[PDB]
Every structure is written in structure tokens, then in C-alpha cells.
Amino acid sequence: HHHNKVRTCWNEGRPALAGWLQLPGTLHAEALARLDYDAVVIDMQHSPIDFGQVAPMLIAIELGGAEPFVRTQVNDPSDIMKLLDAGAYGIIAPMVNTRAEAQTLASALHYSPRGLRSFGPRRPSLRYGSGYLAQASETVVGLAMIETREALANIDEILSVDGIDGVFIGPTDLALDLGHAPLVDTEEAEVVSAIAHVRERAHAAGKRVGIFCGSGGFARVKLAEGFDFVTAAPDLAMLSAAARQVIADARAL
Amino acid sequence: HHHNKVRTCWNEGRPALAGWLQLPGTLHAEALARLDYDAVVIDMQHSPIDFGQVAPMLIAIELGGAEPFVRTQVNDPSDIMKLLDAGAYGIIAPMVNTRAEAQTLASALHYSPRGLRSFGPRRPSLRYGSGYLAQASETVVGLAMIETREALANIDEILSVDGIDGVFIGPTDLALDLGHAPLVDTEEAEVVSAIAHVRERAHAAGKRVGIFCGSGGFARVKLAEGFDFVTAAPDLAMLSAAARQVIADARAL
Amino acid sequence: HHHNKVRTCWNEGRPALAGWLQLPGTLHAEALARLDYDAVVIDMQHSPIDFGQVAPMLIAIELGGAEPFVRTQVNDPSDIMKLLDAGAYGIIAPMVNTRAEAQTLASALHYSPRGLRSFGPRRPSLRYGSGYLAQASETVVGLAMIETREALANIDEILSVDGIDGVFIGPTDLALDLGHAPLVDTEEAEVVSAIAHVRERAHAAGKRVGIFCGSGGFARVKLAEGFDFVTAAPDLAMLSAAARQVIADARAL
Amino acid sequence: HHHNKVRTCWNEGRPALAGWLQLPGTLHAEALARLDYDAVVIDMQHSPIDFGQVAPMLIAIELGGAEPFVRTQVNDPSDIMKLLDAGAYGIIAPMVNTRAEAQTLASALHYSPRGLRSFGPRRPSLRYGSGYLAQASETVVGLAMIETREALANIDEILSVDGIDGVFIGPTDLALDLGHAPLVDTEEAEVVSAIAHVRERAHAAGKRVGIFCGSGGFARVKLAEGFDFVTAAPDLAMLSAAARQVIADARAL
Amino acid sequence: HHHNKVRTCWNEGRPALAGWLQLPGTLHAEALARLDYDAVVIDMQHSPIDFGQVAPMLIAIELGGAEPFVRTQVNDPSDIMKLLDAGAYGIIAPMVNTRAEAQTLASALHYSPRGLRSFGPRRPSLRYGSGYLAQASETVVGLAMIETREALANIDEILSVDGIDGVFIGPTDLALDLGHAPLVDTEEAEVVSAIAHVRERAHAAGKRVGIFCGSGGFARVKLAEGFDFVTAAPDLAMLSAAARQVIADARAL
Amino acid sequence: HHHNKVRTCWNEGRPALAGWLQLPGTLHAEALARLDYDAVVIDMQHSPIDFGQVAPMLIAIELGGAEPFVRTQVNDPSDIMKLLDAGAYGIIAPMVNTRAEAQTLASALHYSPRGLRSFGPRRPSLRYGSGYLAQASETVVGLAMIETREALANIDEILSVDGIDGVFIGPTDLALDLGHAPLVDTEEAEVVSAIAHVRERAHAAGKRVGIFCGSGGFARVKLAEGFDFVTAAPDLAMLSAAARQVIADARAL
Ligand SMILES: [Br-]
Ligand SMILES: [Br-]
Ligand SMILES: [Br-]
Ligand SMILES: [Br-]
Ligand SMILES: [Br-]
Ligand SMILES: [Br-]
Ligand SMILES: [Br-]
Ligand SMILES: [Br-]
Ligand SMILES: [Br-]
Ligand SMILES: [Br-]
Ligand SMILES: [Br-]
Ligand SMILES: [Br-]
Ligand SMILES: [K+]
Ligand SMILES: [K+]
Ligand SMILES: [K+]
Ligand SMILES: [K+]
Ligand SMILES: [K+]
Ligand SMILES: [K+]
């Protein structure tokens, strides 16, 4: 338990595949973490998961053997710091549209002098022991979300920020801001082109790029295109679709 | 909202198909209730769902448009009464092995003189209004679980109990008590024979019979065999299987 | 804080008036406890209040200056003991129909040798300090509910049980068991006669008698009749009625 | 369930009357929603109601048949977005003192291009179905609170903001900022004059105006004066007053 | 994680030392589990810890590296089964006074044919994988508490019950039932003699014996006397004592 | 209960000693409040304690007889206001680095005209009664944390802010920002010198100064040096250390 599993993937030359949870609770969190996911992201933006509910989920994901990540409600330093101290080891912050906002994200992820993270690592100290402080930055992964035309306009400046590992595309909001339907795994040409451009710029910068996916097949293609961090697919969406199919099968003549 | 949707299926000559939840929370409960399920059963036996977590789930299922059912942890009258008053409108009680235990279940489901249910129907009174008391028995469905060789031995006496609608087979415990593996949707001959026998005896008694299913295809066959109430399939099992397949698809060459 | 406020009323020659809560939460609990109520009863039978929600409510009632009481879901010794150790100082147990059931209630309320209460008084020890054990019995009030024709039949035997202070009439269930509507504050002659009889028998036995009331005027009359413990009226009922009147006043021409 | 009940009142030429909850929990929320309230506002500013407790309350209000509204703790976009995605369909934001702050509120309530609301409408999509995005703005009501002399000074500029329906007066804070006692339903002339002025300016702008009321009679007068959205009265205040009166009636000679 | 750490101690010829938690929450649970405790017992009898709060604590203890145990509120089969399925791997049941009560405890801990445990091992299946059923009995430790003169009278019959590992002395209740003060780590001769007798009888029966301790020094002596399972000391007691000493040190001249 | 216990210490010429809680829950909160602590600080920054969990803890601390304080996650006005209205009577805000940030803290603590605190004091009104508004400022203590080189640089300007009582040193973050290990109770000369300087400047300004301590002996020395508010020591740290010692004592030969 003495390495961030996602950073280990990267250091060993492979991308990371992560789950995505919008449903609160520990039981499915542990169960999915025990599958061949490198990380499980808990969504605190588009879900009813508040801090009180995320906290035990982090424990359950770690026990199950995946790295606990959180997609926060907002890029707020103190919110992020409190998640880090509760044992979130990856942070995906929404709506990072400028270099300054990316610097605000980075500031929360590193103790002085690299950042201004406040010191009181209740759960990381239990995981990593006495040597935590010297390795703390490496234990956390940080990605800025790219979800607007403004973020696209500022992508090179965002990617130039030290202390974030790279960017995570939110393609539904991106489609909407471009005037298209917010369809997951879209084929809309302007959105597909923007996604490819963000990936190309991130790799030109020597940074990591991730993307939210709605299906296993789309995730496979994103991995083939070279994305470093791919999520697939939300618990609620997979569960709904599975139940709809069970009903169709049960009710068929 | 002025009828129990499962009793309406039966009264209109069709069986009922129900979901099965072992994961706490309201969001997937509502989402699954809005699918073509007549009822959604919340499992309080083989899950971490306690009373505090079941209570909002009942609300969410009703809002979504399925009848809220609970499979209780135990056949205990006061537990059942408190669920009824919180807006559980179907009760499946585990480990009903004798006529006396079936009578104990029935006692909880009916006000005097048919039973001894205590009066204080906080949520049913809001749903049904001033005429609730006169229709209360019809608003609730009750099924005794058949899960042991003892329950099999006593099946005709259990089915003779007034004030339960019938029985619900728990085929994993039944297999185990017969010395076989607790495989859902089993083909083991002795278990399949016992299941068919329970159904035959329930219908000979003019009662309803249900069964827990692990798949849509098995549920379809159970409906074809004449089961009146079929559950398919647990949220956690469907979600796990869906995630495992998404991972396999994403990681494939 | 070194006396049970209800026992102090009795010892000083006056009855006790108590509130009644079916809504979970601490804020209204404290607010009502600060009114001229001697006790506030938290209903864990006909409400969604589970142990996790009752526990902080007990604290809030004590801070507000009323004695915290609980009407339990069932007459179960271990449930009652855990409430006592969480700082419930009055227990009203439903559906006590026989002397044996009354003895079961009494057993939970007293340490050996008078009863079999298990020792680990987390919150009473904080309230009462080192001398708690020697005074423990006096710190708790216990009342058996009388809610059925069977309990009426056995009233003298129930009242003969040492280690309960007396009985608490539940007049809605009593009406129902007699074949009448479960109207609070009923005028139905057979119910009114049964209520008076229970009071007379309790006083002939030198015991205390209480009754659940739905209105202040009915409570006043019950106090005038000599009831020792009167509750009036449920939070939810008072709040509903108040809101209905505010709406009528607001929407009037 | 395919319209916002408050907007329907307005579209049909009538004002809306709403409840106001400072007590957490679902049971009174549903019960009050089933009364003749068009909406029920949950107060997350002057209450102990956090996100974890508001979430089930929204479900309960909708089931009961009133539109779920929230008065937030602060005018924060991401907080508001997460409430919208949990099924809050009306937002009242405190302490909106400038046009810029009003624009910040409006930004959270509309998807691009009218605003920057992030896309992931977990509960609205369940309520409204596939056509949600095209109707999303109409499904939500937004009101900026007017609670300071500064907000009074800027009232015309605040009212000029597209994408909020209007303003909601908080008359206790307004009184305090003017140097008067924070009495609900005040008669203090300067406060009464400021309230009338805000209403007049809102109607001159073709916008809606609301006000918090402490009594049914005051609410009736506010409706007669032409307020479009009137709240009356807080659950805790109504419950306290009702209990105080029950005690007075019970303890009277 | 594929063995019960307490059974491993025993199988390797050493006793087990366990912590004892009366405070709800995961953070101290994990922290104490990471110390040199073989197990951590969560007290659900003399604490405010309900099922909803115990569930995440079990996860946290396992992550920290101690075996999660529960001292239940009561010897109730269905309560115990639900704890087992939530990942409690040791059960200490209070107030086991007869062989029949010991048989009731054993019945809950073993699948058929050795017992009647119901099948649905949500969390054990995640821990132990597909081979769980064949090893399930070995994964769980069960101890009956000896806390009364009656249990002392029946000690040999209790120890003769197959399917419990042995007994756990509760010396405060035992002292009380003998008419002595309920002092932890008592020197009262009759209590000390009864404790020694229970240990001697348990070892004569080839069974395990445990005892609750209030201090490290007493625990050391109990280990030297040959107790197989020693708890020391309750979180709340240790924390209180530590705080009292910090205050005394801070306030000293 | 009609005075802030910490302000009473100061008014009577003595410093205040306070506890420090990072573990959620009411039982240890009450127990520690009943010790000779003037206040108990609940840490909402470096802990998993969210609003839903802090709220009952405030009640428990007040019942136990210490003043409830909160160290917030961030210096945010609306967060602070909601804590005040839930009965936090002392606020310690982290990372106050400039006079403007100190003014933002002060603004939240006082009603107009001294500040802009919003009016709706649910719990203070219950504690203090009708005269609350006129005494509200005195009922609350506010301290700005000094945790960075920037805050050191701006210490005199921070201390010049009306409406905060003074400053609270966070010496672990301060050490880190100076390039030293974040050891509690440090002897590192530059940190010790900075701490003394902050105290000297606070007293030159006629203000109060506090410091977080990790031990009773260090706290004693800080009191001797003239600190006005000393915390010692975190619940989790004291509990861990106590358990480690119990284990060492139990396992010793
Ligand atoms: Br897998
Ligand atoms: Br999706
Ligand atoms: Br469907
Ligand atoms: Br299954
Ligand atoms: Br009063
Ligand atoms: Br009533
Ligand atoms: Br109405
Ligand atoms: Br009001
Ligand atoms: Br250790
Ligand atoms: Br102890
Ligand atoms: Br002390
Ligand atoms: Br420390
Ligand atoms: K994994
Ligand atoms: K449905
Ligand atoms: K009182
Ligand atoms: K309505
Ligand atoms: K360990
Ligand atoms: K104190």
C-alpha cells in the first residue's frame, strides 16, 4: 500500500483504467475496487455524495485494492485538502478554465514549498507511516478538468502548470459549451476534434491526459489513442442499463 | 397511488416482477423503480441496509412508481410494523419454517380483529388518506420465505395460514440445507424438484408463490412456470457483472 | 441534573406533563424541552426514529431541561438497556399484555438483585457521577402500556409487578381492539369506561397511570381526573395542524 | 410532474404560497407538501440542514406534491448546481447585494449558452425524461435575496439580471441592517417602506417578488399587496408555538 | 487476509490481545487496528454504536490489520448473521447463561449442517473469494459471555457446546450479580475465584477463555494466567484518563 | 449557561485551557467537556468531521459544561455563520494571512453594524433567550490562525482588526512554511522564536493569543509564558498513545 497505483501504472509504462461512482455507499465501492480497476473515482459533483458519505467509501476502495480518487464538486483548496487528509489519493477538479485556476488546484496538492497544503494527514500518515512527508507529493495524483471552450482556448497554459499531472476531459460539458448535445462517447466532429487536440497538446507538454467514458468499447479506443487515464463507466448508468436488460429478458415472450 | 401495484397485477391476472436492492441509497432505488418493475424489494437481511437507510429508500421507490417491498432481517412483528408505518407495502420474511411462524408473520400485517398490528400509520395515512383503516389489509402484501427442509416439510400447513398472500422461495438457503451448493438459478435436481413442489402446493392452496432469481432468463422461465412474484436480479450482482464486462471490453486488445 | 424530573413531580405531589416526538432531530427536541414540559417522550414505535437518531435527541432534551423518555418499538430487555445507557431516563414499553411481560419490562430497569440490567452506564455515569449505582433505580421511570382487551383483562396482575412505576394507556390501539375507530381523545363510551377503569385500578394499587393525549384540552381533563403522567401532543400532529391553519389564513379572501 | 408548480401558478395568473423548513427529516416534509402549499422551501442557511439531510427531503416534498425549493447557505454556483442535480427545483440565494452577485446566481441556473451550469442532472433527468435539456431552464425557479441596505441601493440593477425570476425579501436581516430589531412581520415604518419599494421596483421591471412571512395573516396581506411568492411559516416556529399553547391549555385550571 | 488473525494466534500457540471500542467512527478504529492488536472488538451493547455505525468500522479495522470483532447487544441469531455478512469475523454474545443459549449462539455461526446461518455473505465473499463456503466456519470466532451466577452454575454445560470456541468473562456484571461493586480488574475474592474457576473449566474442556480488562497490567497478568483472548482497554476509558492527565499536567503549578 | 466560559476566564484574569477533537461523535465530546476544560475545540479541517457530525457534538459539549468551539476548514463567512447558529460559540479560522482575511473573519462574527452576520440564531436564542441580540458579540470568541511566514509578516496588521479577540498559532504549518519538520511542541529555534514574537505582538496590541499543544507539559509552559488560550491535546493522538502503552504493558514479559 506504499505507492499510488495510478502513478505506478504510469511509471511502469501503462495507462490506468478507473471506475466511477455516483452512488453513495461502501459495498459496491469495495466490490468494484476488487475488480481490475487501478483506481475508483468517487463523483462529488453530479451525485448526492457529500463528505460524510465519501469518507467511508475511500476506506472501502483502498481495502478492495484500487486507488481512491475523487472528482470534487469544485476546485476549492480547503475542500481538496480535507479529502486528501481523509485518504483521497487522486483529485480531479471540475471546471478548470485558466492557468490561474490550474495553479489553485496545484497549490492544494503539495506541502510548502511547492504548494500550500495544510498539514494534518490523518489517514495518509496511517497508510504511509513516518516517511510520509518526504514522499507526500508522489502519493497524490491531480488532474484539471477541461470542460469549456475557455479551457480549450487556454489548454497550453493550463498544461504548463507544475504540480498537476495533467488534464481530464469532461466531454459532455464540452459538447454543451460548443452548442451540441451532451452525449457521452459522442461522435460529433467538433467535439471529437477538440478531444484529440487536448490529448495532443497534453502529450506535447509531457503531461498526462484522461477522459470520462460511458462504455467499455469507447474506453478501449481511448486507450488505443494514448489516453493515460480512462474512466468507464458510472455505477448508476451501468446498473440502470443492466436492470433494464434483465427486465426485458424476464418479460420477453 | 391508491392501490398496491403488486396486488393490482394479481387482481388483473398477471404476475409481478420486482427488483432487489442490497445497496443502500435513494438514487438507484428511484431509477430502478422507474423501470418496468412492479415492485422493488429492499433486502435488510443480506445487506448493510439498516432501518435508518431503508426509510428514505421507501420514499424514493414510491416516487419512482414501483411498490416498495422489504425482505426483513427476521420474522419479528414489531420490526415489520415499524416498516409498514414507514411505507413498506410488501413484507417478505425470511426463515418461516412452521405454521406458527407463518401465523406470527400474518399477525403483524393486519389490524385487529384479523391481526394485532399496532396503530400509527405515519406514511400509509399520507398515501391513502382518511379511508386507510378500512382498506389497510389490502394495501400490504405478505410472503413467508421457504428456505429449509423443515419449511418444505411444513409447506401445506404454512400455506393454510390466513392473512399471508403466500410464500417466497429462497433457493440458495434451500440448496444449502439439502447439502448442495448455494448457486442461484440452480439446476440441481433435488432443489429444482423442491421448488416445483412448493409452487404446486401453493397453487393447490389457492395462494401466491414467488422466487428469488439471479438472471432475466431464469426469471422468464419462472414466470412461464406460473410463479406469481419473481425478483430479478440483485443490484450489487448486476452492477458487479456490468463493471467486470466494461473492464474486459476496455482492456481487450 | 441529579434527579429524574418526573419522579420529582410525583415526589412533590404533582403530575407530570410530557411532550411526544415522532420527528427525528435535535433542534425541535431541545426547543420543546425548554418549554414547560417535565419530560419529552421520543416515539420509536410509530415513527422513523431508529437508535442512531434517538441518541442525539436524548442529549438535546436533557440540555433543554426536560427528562428524556422513550416509547420503545417493543418490550425487549436489551433494546431498553441500550437506551438506558444512552441516557433515556424513562421507558414506556408498548403492548404489555400480561404480568410476565410486565416482569420482563421491570427486569430491564434495575440492576441485580432487583432486576438483570447489564452494567455499562455510559451516559448515566456522566450525569450522576460516582454515586450512580446506589441510586440507579430511582433515576429511571418505567411504564407498561395498556393497549388491548387482554391487557385490560390482566390489569390488576400487571399493576402488581414490582419495579415498574405503573401503566400508560394507549387509547387508539385499545379502541381498535374493542372494535371502534382509533380516534385520539375519543368519546366512545366503552373506551372511556375502560380508560377510567385502568386509572381506578392503578390508583387502588398505589401505582401511577399515564395516558397519551392529542390535545391540550383533553390533557387538562385527564390531569383533573388524576392521571399522573399525561402526554400532549405529537410534534407531527401539532405541526401539521399549525401549517394547515397558516395556509387557510394565508389563502383566505 | 412535468412542470414546476410555482412557475405554473405564475403562468396561470396566481401567486405561489410555500412552506419553510428548518427541521431536518422527510416525514414532516412530505406531510406539509401534501397540504395546499405550491412549494416547500428547505432552509440550509439558518438551520442544521446539510446536504446529506436535504437530499432525502427533496424526494419527500416531490412525492407529497409540492415543488422542492432550497434557500441556500450562500450564493455559490457549485453548491447550487449540486442541489439542482439532486432535485431542487427552486433556489433562493441569500445576501445578493449587487448585479454581479445576481449574475453569479443566474449563471448557476442555466446550461450554456444562457449560463454555465454543469451537466449531470441525476434526478431532473428521472423526473423529466429525455426532453429535459430543452426545457431545463423552465423547470427551475431562481430568486435573489434582498437583505441589506446595499441590496436596496442596487435593487434596479439586480432586477435587470436575465435568468433570475426576481427577488425574495429577507426582512429580518433588512431590519437589522437599517438599525431596527429583526422582528418578523414588522411594522417598523422604514422597513415596511423598503419592502414596498422593492416590490414596486420588481413589478416595474416585470419580475417576480417574494417575501418571508411569520404568520398566515401577514402572508394574506402580502398576497393582497401583490407579492408573487410568499412563505409562511417556519416549521420550528409553528411547532414551538403550537406546543406552548398545548402546554398552556393542559396546565390551565 | 485469508485467515482469521485470532484463530491464527491460537493455531500458532499464542493468545490474542484485542482492543475494545465504545466510540463510533472509523478513524480511531483504523488507527488502533494498526497497533499490535490481533483484533479490535466493537461494543454494540454498552455504547451508542448501532448497525449503521458499526458497518464502516468493520471495514476500517480490517484495512488497519486487525480482525474485526463485535460484542453484540444480545445473543440474537439474525442480528449476528447480519454482522457476519457485513464482515464481523468474531462474535462475543452477552448474557449466555445456559447450554440452550450457547447452542443458539453456535447456530448463528455455521452454515448447515453444523448450524443454520443464512447464506448471503456480502463482505466475506469479497475477502475470501470463491472458496469461502468450504472454509466459512474457520473464518469466524465465537465466544459466549459469562456474566451471571447462573452462567457460572452452568459453565460446564455451556463449554460442552460444539461450534463456539469458548467463553468470554464479563467481570463487572459478574461482580454485580454476586452482590459486589462492578469494579473492572477487581480484587474482590469471590469474583477473582469465580474468574479462575471459569478459566480452569474452559481449559479442562479443551476450549478457549477470554476476559475483559481495564488496564495493561491486569491484561499482562491474565495472559500469564493462561487466558486465550484478552481485551484491554476501552477507547473511551483510555481517552478520558489520558485527557484528565493532560489537564492535570497543564494546570499544575 | 448565560456566558461564554472562555470570555469569563479572560474577564476574571485567567487563561483558558481547551480540548481538541478530531474524532466525530458525542460520547467522548461530553465526557471530555465534563473534565476541567473551559472549552472543547472541534477540528473540522484535519479530521473527517463534517457539518452533519459537528452539530450534535456542539450540543454534547455544552451539556458537559465546556464552551463549544470549532476550528473550521476555512475562513468562510457563511460556513462560520451556520456554525454560530448551530451553537458554536468559538471560531478558530485557519490560514488567516492578511488584515483583509482577518476582517473577513471578524465580519462573520458580529451582526450589523459591527459586522454582517446574518440573523437566524436557532440555538443561541434557545441558550440565551430574548436578550440574545444585545449581547450576541460577547457570546462568541474569534481567533485568526497564524500558520505561515506571510501571516508572520502581517501579524501587527492582523492584530489591529477590531472584532476578533486575537490569534491562534498553528505551529506545525508554521514550521513547514519555514522549511522545518512539522513536529508538534517543537524546539526548533526559528519556530520557537516566531511563536514568542507572535505572542509578544499580540500582547503589545492588547489582544489574546492562543497555541495548539501536543502535550500537557508543553501546555503548562505555554500558560506560564502568558498564552491566553491553550489547547491540549488531540483526542486521536491521546487515544493512540494510550492504546500503544496498554499494548506494551499487556505484552511485556
Ligand atoms: Br475484473
Ligand atoms: Br455515462
Ligand atoms: Br424498463
Ligand atoms: Br444473485
Ligand atoms: Br411553555
Ligand atoms: Br394525535
Ligand atoms: Br391544506
Ligand atoms: Br418566523
Ligand atoms: Br503497538
Ligand atoms: Br474499563
Ligand atoms: Br479533569
Ligand atoms: Br498532536
Ligand atoms: K483493483
Ligand atoms: K415502475
Ligand atoms: K422543561
Ligand atoms: K401541495
Ligand atoms: K494489528
Ligand atoms: K468543563
Numbering used by the authors:
A (entry chain A), B (entry chain A), C (entry chain A), D (entry chain A), E (entry chain A), F (entry chain A): -1 to 251
What does the paper say about this structure?
Here structural analysis of hydroxyketoacid aldolase from Sphingomonas wittichii RW1 (SwHKA) revealed a dynamic movement of the metal cofactor between two coordination spheres without protein scaffold rearrangements. Holo‐SwHKA forms a trimer of homodimers, in which each monomer adopts an (α/β)8 triosephosphate isomerase (TIM) barrel fold. In total, holo‐SwHKA contains six equivalent active sites; each of which is formed from amino acids from two different domain‐swapped dimers. The transition from M2+ R to M2+ A,S is induced by bidentate substrate binding and occurs without a concomitant rearrangement of the protein scaffold.
Crystals of WT apo‐SwHKA and mutant variants thereof were soaked with MgCl2 or MnCl2 to afford the holo‐enzyme.
